[PDB]
Amino acid sequence: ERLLDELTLEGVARYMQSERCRRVICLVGAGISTSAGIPDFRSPSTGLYDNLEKYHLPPEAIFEISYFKKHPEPFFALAKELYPGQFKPTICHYFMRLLKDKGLLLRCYTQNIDTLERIAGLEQEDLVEAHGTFYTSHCVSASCRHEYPLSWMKEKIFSEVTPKCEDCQSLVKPDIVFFGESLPARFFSCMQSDFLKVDLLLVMGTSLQVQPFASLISKAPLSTPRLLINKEKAGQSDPFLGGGGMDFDSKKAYRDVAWLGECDQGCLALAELLGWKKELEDLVRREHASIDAQS
Amino acid sequence: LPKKYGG
Ligand SMILES: *C(=O)CC(C)(C)SCCCCCCCCCCCC
Ligand SMILES: [Zn+2]
């Protein structure tokens, strides 16, 4: 006997509204922000890195910290080119805000750097930004580390002035984790505590191909149901590489459910099952109108 | 602490 009465979205919703389900961890990737216009920065099939010759570069050096600290100009020129015209979180982001409102959100682990989780109303304590964030920036000198807000960094990016610390004139870097940098200590300390406590893993908009983030699904207790909302099935064991892997379809499947489609539409469907459609619609329309009215 | 690598 398993926790889901059937391996479907309808089964998951019944489980969430049972007393057995109290603490939900969300694992989210670039798929939850493409609807807001944010490209997948890890995908070479998004045309982001087609115009890098102008930067007279050696490709991956654009995001390697060693290269950045010596030649920061290419990164900041790219950042200007790609800076979003607007920061409007998606239906998926506000669904997690509703999970928070209803006392169900234990933690959201995000691969994204775009700050939309914070704009949607998740708080720092709710979030593990596994790859950092553009939300804040810091001087890179170890004896300084002066912090700067996005408004300050934005103004440097758009005026094409390489950002420098006002106290010490070292370079100032967005708090994203470049290649070559340590991953955040908070990612590991939170994982060791949260996965002792999780009742449901909600995995949305990630293909689960980037480590160590993808290994989080194997940290769940064996009984914990795992729902994937994503355009493509993901997280199954690799027939070549072979283990915590997802099992949606075998005769041994017992807890993993795949809902295949756009993340906004899957979150809409789950909310409707939960009785939350009107609440979710009202929240999105209100926050979107507010952002659109920013003067 | 582990460093960030491709993939
Ligand atoms: C690790 O996987 C994280 C990455 C190094 C891939 S994040 C790369 C981010 C590149 C940003 C370019 C400029 C975009 C500016 C957007 C600012 C608000 C999000
Ligand atoms: Zn400084």
Sheet containing strand A226-230, strands side by side: A127-129, A105-110, A24-28, A200-204, A226-230, A256-260
* A193-196 LR contacts (CB < 8 Å, sep 24+): A194/A25, A194/A106, A194/A107, A195/A25, A195/A219, A195/A220, A195/A221
Is any atom of ligand 1 closer than 6 Å to the C-beta of A61? no
- A12 CB contacts (<8 Å, ≥6 apart)? A4, A200, A225, A227, A257, A270
Q: Kindly state the tokens that stand for A72.
A: 């920061």
Residue A146: count other Cβ atoms within 10 Å of its Cβ: 14
Q: Helix or strand or coil: residue A1?
A: coil
- A69 CB contacts (<8 Å, ≥6 apart)? A140, A171
Dihedral of the alpha carbons of A6, A266, A19, A14, in degrees to the nearest 10: -40
Residue B2, min C-alpha distance to chain A (Å): 5
CA A67 to chain centroid: 25
CB contact under 8 A, A188 and B7: no
Enumerate the domain spans of chain A.
1-34+90-130+185-295, 35-89+131-184
Q: Which atom of ligand 1 is nearest to the CA of A81?
A: 13
Contact indicator for A233, A260 with CB cutoff of 8 Å: yes
Is any atom of ligand 1 closer than 6 Å to the C-beta of A78? yes
Q: Which atom of ligand 1 is nearest to the CA of A179?
A: 5
Q: How far apart are alpha carbons A9 and A270 in whole angstroms? A: 7
User: Which residues of A are documented as binding site for NAD(+)?
Assistant: 30-34, 40-42, 111-114, 206-207, 230-232, 263
Q: Which residues face A174 on adjacent strands?
A: A137
Q: Where are the alpha helices (DSSP H) in chain A?
A: 9-16, 65-70, 73-82, 91-101, 116-119, 150-159, 185-194, 263-274, 277-292
Q: Which CATH class is domain A1-34+90-130+185-295?
A: alpha beta
Residue B6, min C-alpha distance to chain A (Å): 7
Q: Helix or strand or coil: residue A10?
A: helix
Tell me which residues of A are annotated as active site: 131
**What is the resolution of the experimental data for this entry, in Å?**
1.9
Q: Which amino acid is at A274?
A: L
Dihedral of the alpha carbons of A94, A133, A48, A210, in degrees to the nearest 10: -90
In the block, residue with structure tokens 């290994």: A215
CB contact under 8 A, A60 and B2: no
CA distances from A260 to A3, A13, A25, A228 (A): 22, 16, 20, 8
CB contact under 8 A, B3 and A181: yes
Dihedral of the alpha carbons of A97, A101, A103, A108, in degrees to the nearest 10: 10
Q: At what angle do helices A91-101 and A263-274 cross, to 10 degrees?
A: 30
Q: Which of B1, B3, B4 to mutate to test the interface with A (most CBs of A within 10 A)?
A: B4
Ligand in closest contact with the CA of A117: 1
User: Taking the domain A35-89+131-184, which CATH number applies?
Assistant: 3.30.1600.10
